[PDB]
Amino acid sequence: SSLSLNVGSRVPSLFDVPGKWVAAGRDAEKPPPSSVEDMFTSLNRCIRRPTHSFSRLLELYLRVHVA
Amino acid sequence: PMINNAIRSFLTAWDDIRILSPDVSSKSLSAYLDSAVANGPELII
């Protein structure tokens, strides 16, 4: 906040590592049908959404014309 | 750009220290002077 460029941004601290390890244990666990349908509905909402812009890097990459 | 960040940091460095202060006015002059009134010996009895 003092340098004032980001807020809440992900920086790889060592408290991400128990979050990295424990989430690397439930990935092999079979998900419940509540989690699959929530993953499934988020697909169709992601496809049909009217966000017709790219990411803010590819929108900046396309200024560069290479030949 | 980057040098303006040192400007913005400095002018907000002193402003936060400045607003961390009691209010100065003529009311503080009378409030300080009230402390010198109550410690008065009665002589004219």
Contact B5 A4 (CB under 8 A): yes
Radius of gyration of chain A (CA): 19
Q: Which amino acid is at A52?
A: H
In this complex, is the C-beta atom of A2 within 8 Å of any C-beta atom belonging to chain B? yes
Q: Report which of A43, A42, A39 is spatially closest to residue A27, judged by C-alpha positions.
A: A39
Which of B2, B3, B4, B5 to mutate: most A Cβ within 10 Å? B5
Residue spans of beta strands (DSSP E) within B1-45: none
Contact A2 B5 (CB under 8 A): no
Resolution reached, in Å? 3.4
B1-27: string of b/e by CB count within 10 Å (b at 16+)? eeeeeeeeeeeeeeeeeeeeeeeeeee
- Where residue B22 falls (left for φ over 0; alpha for ψ -120 to 50; beta otherwise) is beta
Experimental technique, in short, is cryo-EM
Q: Are A59 and A51 in contact (CB under 8 A)?
A: no
Contact B5 A3 (CB under 8 A): yes
